[PDB]
Structures are given as structure tokens and as C-alpha cells.
Amino acid sequence: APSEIVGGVPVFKPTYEQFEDFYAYCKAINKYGMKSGVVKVIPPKEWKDKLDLPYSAETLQKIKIKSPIQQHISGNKGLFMVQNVEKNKTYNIIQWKDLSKDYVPPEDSSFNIDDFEQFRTEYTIDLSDFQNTERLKFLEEYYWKTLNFTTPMYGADTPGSIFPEGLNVWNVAKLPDSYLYAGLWKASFSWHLEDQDLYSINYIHFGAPKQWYSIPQEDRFKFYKFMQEQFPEEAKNCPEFLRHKMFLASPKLLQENGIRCNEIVHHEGEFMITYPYGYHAGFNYGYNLAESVNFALE
């Protein structure tokens, strides 16, 4: 299968025909993901129809944000290290959509089954805003300019899924183990490579887009050494600290260090596939709900 476009990152727009086989499709297009850190995969229209929108009141009620994480980040510029916090409290989707009213981007009680049935018209957020490229460029630049001035809060992994139960095609929840992230403006995921160095699919069910950065496998050693440069203290008692501590590094910085860095914007209804030995990191542009699993092809 051919790559449709490129934002430094391969973009695939498969037809339901080939899209049908997830394993055969992934195995027929792995040579691209092993070059660039990640690959985007837009599902076909006849697939998006298989979805049930809006989600039923129960589907929404099932959503439970277990142990939210706040991030305390510190660092001059380009380099930052994040100190994820604890959130003993727990939220439901309605509470999270409301919580996103505190973590708003710049410009320029007990609950009943009825509450969710009502919320079936408010679970989304206006996306026409993020349709502008220069708009996204702005947010990203503001994000790097002001990372240590805020304590972002993520909806750290929580088992579950919102994909149609009767859905077997591309069922990220059940493939022939799924988790939900709760996005919030400026919430960031540092540099890392999936455990056991496996693959993973990340799907944004709804909400603001995600920003993605990936290091081409070829540069995973330049990148590694450069990270041993800064933070030399860890270069001692650590064989693997990129998977021990949380570190953020801007592309603009890496670029000007002989380390290529891919960048792409992950939108609602799209799939991202992280490949083995493909370092990746990024942040959220605001309120969203994402689902992801880790798999293997061999």
C-alpha cells in the first residue's frame, strides 16, 4: 500500500477494502513506520459510519477518569522535565468536559442516567477552531513558550473502550486491553518508546487534536546520546531513563542538533500508529477522549 501524503510523517488513507484486514494491512505497510517514528491512518467513510454517534447514555456513563495526573514541568527552554502529580479524586465525562473550562487555550452532586442522556449534545467541542493551520501553529508556539507557567492535568490511562461492542473491524478494544486518555489543553506526554518496544494504535474519539513528535529510527541513537548530554546525573545510575523519568524536548531544538524530528497533528476520528524504536512525544490541544492499545505483528 502507498502513502497518501507526508507531514514529515506518512499519512495513509486506505479504502475499507484493504483497511478491512488490520494485521495484513499493518504487515503490508510496516516499512514506513520503521523509518519515521509514527504513521497516521485515516479510516474510510464506510468505516466511520459503523460508529454510533452520539454515544448512548450508558456508553457515556461508563466513562470513568480514574486517578487524573497533574504535571509540574520545569526547564529553561527546549529542555523540560515533568513531575506528574497525584489525583486521588475521580471524574466522569460530564465533570471532565466541565473541568476543561479551567484549562482553556489563549485566543488571538450525584449523577443520574438522565444527566448523560442530556449530555449527548454537549460531549463534543467546537473544532472549527483547530481547522486553521496558523491557529495550531500559534498554540504550539505558546505551548513551548509557556510550559512551566502551568500545571496541566491529564486523564491518565484507564481500562475501557467506547467502540461499538458489535464492532469487530479495527476494534482497537478487541483485535484478533484498551485504555482511555482524557485530554486537556497543554497536557503533555514526554519522550518514550512503548514497553517491550511494541506497536500501538491511538484513536481520538472526540475533542481537540493532539500534537505528535517522533524521532526517525535512524536517529534514535543521536537522540539517545543528546539526552545523555543534558541531565548527565542520570547518565550514571541509569541504563534507560527515557523510560524511567519524564522528559520534554522541543523539535526546533532537536532539529538544530543533528537530530531529525517528525511533527504531525492528530485529529478527531484519525488513527496514529507508533512503531518499535520510534521515540514519540507531544501534547493535547484541549478537551478530548482517546483510546489506545499495544500490539505486535510478529
Swiss-Prot record:
RAD53-dependent phosphorylated in response to DNA damage. Transmembrane segments: none annotated. Residues 9-50 form the JmjN domain. It comes from the Eukaryota. Residues 164-298 form the JmjC domain. Coiled coil: none annotated. It is found in: Nucleus. Present with 2229 molecules/cell in log phase SD medium. Transcriptional repressor of photolyase PHR1. Recognizes and binds the sequence AG(4) in the upstream repressing sequence of PHR1. Derepresses PHR1 transcription when phosphorylated. This is DNA damage-responsive transcriptional repressor RPH1. It comes from Saccharomyces cerevisiae (strain ATCC 204508 / S288c) (Baker's yeast). The gene is RPH1. The chain holds residues 6 to 341 of 796 of the full protein.
